[PDB]
């Protein structure tokens, strides 16, 4: 029987996984950062807050300059902000108000939105007719299209409910190549700094680092139980880190290829809607179904220093580039940037 | 204010910005979002465009203007990805509509329709994301459920009918009494009906039912319930 | 590309009245705001006026306040500039001038091709100078010009509020480079900027025969925008 022979050999190379990590395993990260300096308690206050949506923000994301700053909400449009003085640069509406997610390309000239309609647009500000209109529309997706994200200016990976990622390239309107080996819905997306990998979580509770031109698999993450929603490269791109349904944050080492550490709070039993990290690294900022928002120390695991300023739940969150000042956006159509 | 020229500018473009945002929310404020459901191919799309009709993988939407007030039925429903991950904008609807085809009786791949869309059906009213929401049923084409009734049997599908052989207001009550039952424990409140072409009213229910839905959750906010 | 046309130009008695149009087709005229800028025969470019988008604010030279008049028809896409008691020293082109502000814009980015307006029978402002008039030139040459302010134009926040326009034999002004460092749409990349405070630089390396021409500075922190008397560039 050839699918059992098959079936057996993935078993044995699941084993020889298992004892590989086991013996790698010399001690854990809590077991050699209990000797370092805390960060101690720094609190970061709301400097600006930018009100003019009218239902829930669902995601949003900073320019490469720092600055502006694309946002998109329930009210079928995305808004770029001016986040040194809250003024609105451009207010695009959406062929189909059904928006999950943005993308601020990284040349500052094209944004990316998608969402139920199985479609990526790719809206297009830098033009002569000074107003913002789609320059290609991204179709071939079979299920819902959750984070899209640019590599530069022609090259954008999305991510959809096909359980699949795709590599758009959007000058000719077609895809690459396509990542598949999910079995969930590939939830979250996130870019190595230097753009040669990315990677992917899903609802399975498994992460996947993907090759930009290889195409191919390179590892696997596992160790969450409920469905990976949130991914952010530690900044030098050779770690790693998700948050899950399971009140829980999870680090990822991606040349250690097992766990490296959890963060986590018993009373919290909510789930986590968005990560990321600082500049140097050393604090994973997360938002929370509570409607606060943790700064984990992302290196001893230990800190309660919350962003609490919103009125619902913290969906989507960042850094700047430079690392000046985060920024969240909650259901309460405000965004607020801390410092 | 120790602005410069364009920034002054910039201000006034965001101020505008600001007037369309509030023009377009002044429709936008009002609007209730009510999912539509369905499958099978049973048509629900051609329902929502006969009460388009009646009066004024893909999504349509259809707007209705009801006593100075806007719906807005969202039809949605043709991938077959794990919604789970995908009915997330759709955590808070105000009422979840599943329509039905009663001609689907002893009609089947291999298997008869309304086994599989009960179970649909009862998945959607057991979703832990769905719980603040009212589900509204519509049993559409009860004129060929008559047709048939003149050659089917129900209980030539399904065993534990029991009525006349011909009794098609039984069998009405009997299968609107089948998907009332698969309501859980918990004490949702599940609407009904049953429409026809002509049916000028049902549209109307469909405002009566949100208005006891929404009229519920405020008891349900002050405790009155 | 874009489009606007000028029309009006007709010639009058002195003290009278006219109309000038600016009809746009091309882009969203409804976004941006819009200039009047003129220009005397053998003088250089003055600001004349300015009506913001949607009509908010609107601002006129002094020599000018009271006396012209400005409007704005979005539907049909059009600018008008009414005149009322016209002196003999408004015998000038006329030149509507698109406008874009927000961050990262480009202001002044393009401009109408200019309508006749012959007619026969201030202070606490910033003042621009020009060092020269014209400058000798070999094509293929490495040059720059330089511009003087009364005023550091360097604002507060870090931007600085200066323009460079060229002007070749009979064509409207085209922008050169906005905020004394950022070069326009079509530009090609010879042009640069330099210098800081009231001292302004436009560089252009490996001059081409297409490159000769007029250069002009805005000053752009103040709404009596101020131009300079500017340096025509000559072949040799």
């Known amino acids: 029987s050839e699918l059992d022979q098959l079936r057996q050999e993935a078993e044995q190379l699941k084993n020889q996984i298992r004892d590989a990590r086991k013996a790698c395993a010399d001690a854990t990260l809590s077991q050699i950062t209990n000797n370092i300096d805390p960060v101690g308690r720094i609190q970061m206050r709301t400097r600006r807050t930018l009100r003019g949506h009218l239902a829930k923000i669902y995601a949003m994301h900073w320019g490469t300059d720092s600055r502006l700053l694309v946002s998109a909400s329930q009210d079928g449009k995305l808004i770029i902000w001016d986040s040194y003085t809250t003024n609105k640069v451009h207010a695009i509406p959406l062929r189909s108000s059904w928006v999950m997610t943005c993308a601020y390309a990284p040349s500052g000239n094209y944004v990316a939105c998608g969402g139920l309609d199985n479609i990526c647009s790719i809206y297009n500000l830098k033009t002569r007719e000074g107003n913002v209109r789609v320059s290609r529309e991204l179709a071939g997706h079979t299920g819902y299209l959750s984070c899209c994200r640019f590599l530069d200016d022609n090259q954008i990976v999305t991510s959809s409910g096909d359980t699949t990622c795709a590599l758009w390239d959007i000058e000719t309107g077609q895809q690459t190549t396509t990542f598949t080996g999910h079995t969930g819905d590939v939830m979250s997306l996130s870019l190595a700094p230097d753009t040669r990998l990315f990677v992917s979580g899903a609802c399975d509770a498994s992460a996947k680092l993907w090759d930009v031109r290889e195409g191919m698999c390179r590892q696997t993450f596992t160790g969450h139980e409920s469905d990976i929603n949130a991914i952010c490269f530690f900044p030098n791109g050779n770690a790693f880190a998700t948050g899950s349904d399971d009140a829980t944050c999870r680090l990822f080492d991606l040349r250690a290829d097992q766990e490296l550490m959890t963060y986590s709070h018993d009373n919290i039993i909510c789930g986590i809607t968005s990560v990321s990290f600082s500049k140097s690294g050393r604090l994973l900022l997360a938002g929370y179904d509570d409607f606060n928002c943790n700064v984990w120390d992302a290196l001893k695991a230990d800190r309660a220093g919350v962003l609490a300023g919103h009125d619902n739940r913290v969906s989507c969150l960042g850094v700047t580039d430079d690392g000046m000042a985060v920024a969240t956006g909650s259901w309460d159509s405000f965004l607020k940037i801390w410092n | 204010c120790t602005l410069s020229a364009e920034d002054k500018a910039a201000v006034e473009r965001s101020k505008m910005i600001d007037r369309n945002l509030r023009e377009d929310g002044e429709k936008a404020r009002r609007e209730l979002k009510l999912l539509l459901l369905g499958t099978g191919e049973s048509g629900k799309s051609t329902f929502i465009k006969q009460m388009r009709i009646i009066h004024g993988t893909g999504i349509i939407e259809y707007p209705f203007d009801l006593q100075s007030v806007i719906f807005r039925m969202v039809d949605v429903g043709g991938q077959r990805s794990e919604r789970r991950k995908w009915i997330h904008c759709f955590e808070n609807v105000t009422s979840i509509m599943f329509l039905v085809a009663l001609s689907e009786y002893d009609q089947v791949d291999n298997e008869n329709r309304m086994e599989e869309s009960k179970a649909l059906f009862r998945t959607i009213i057991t979703y832990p994301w769905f719980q603040n929401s009212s589900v509204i049923l519509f049993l559409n084409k009860k004129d060929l459920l008559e047709e048939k009734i003149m050659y089917s049997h129900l209980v030539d599908y399904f065993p534990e009918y029991d009525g006349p052989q011909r009794d098609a207001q039984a069998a009405r009550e009997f299968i609107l009494k089948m998907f009332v039952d698969l309501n859980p424990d918990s004490d949702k409140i599940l609407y009904s009906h049953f429409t026809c072409a002509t049916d000028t009213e049902n549209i109307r229910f469909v405002f009566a039912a949100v208005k006891d839905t929404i009229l519920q959750l405020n008891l349900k906010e002050y405790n009155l319930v | 590309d874009v489009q606007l046309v000028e029309s009006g130009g007709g010639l009058v008695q002195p003290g009278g009245s006219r109309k000038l149009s600016c009809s746009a087709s091309?882009?969203?005229?409804?976004?941006?705001?819009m200039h009047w800028v003129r220009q005397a025969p053998e003088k250089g470019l003055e600001w004349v006026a300015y009506?913001?988008?949607?009509?908010?604010?609107?601002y006129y030279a002094d020599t000018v306040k009271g006396r012209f008049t400005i409007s704005r028809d979005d539907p049909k896409n059009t600018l008008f500039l009414q005149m009322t008691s016209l002196r003999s020293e408004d015998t000038a082109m006329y030149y509507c001038?698109?406008?874009?502000?927000?961050?990262?814009?480009?202001?002044?980015?393009?401009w109408g091709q200019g309508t006749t307006l012959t007619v026969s029978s201030g202070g606490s402002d910033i003042v621009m100078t020009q060092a020269t008039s014209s400058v000798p030139v070999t094509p293929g040459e490495s040059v720059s010009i330089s511009c003087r302010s009364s005023?550091?134009?360097?604002?507060?926040?870090?931007?600085?509020?200066l323009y460079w326009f060229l002007q070749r034999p009979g064509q409207s002004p085209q922008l050169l480079i906005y905020?004394?460092?950022n070069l326009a749409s079509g530009v090609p990349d010879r042009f640069s900027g330099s210098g800081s405070g009231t001292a302004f630089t436009l560089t252009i390396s490996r001059l081409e025969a297409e490159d000769v021409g007029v250069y002009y500075c805005?000053?752009?922190?103040?709404?009596?925008?101020?131009f300079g008397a500017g340096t025509k560039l000559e072949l040799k």
């Open positions: 905020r004394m460092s």
């Open positions: 091309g882009f969203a005229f409804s976004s941006f705001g």
């Open positions: 009506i913001s988008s949607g009509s908010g604010t609107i």
């Open positions: 001038v698109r406008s874009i502000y927000y961050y990262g814009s480009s202001p002044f980015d393009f």
């Open positions: 805005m000053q752009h922190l103040e709404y009596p925008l101020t």
């Open positions: 005023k550091s134009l360097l604002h507060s926040n870090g931007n600085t509020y």
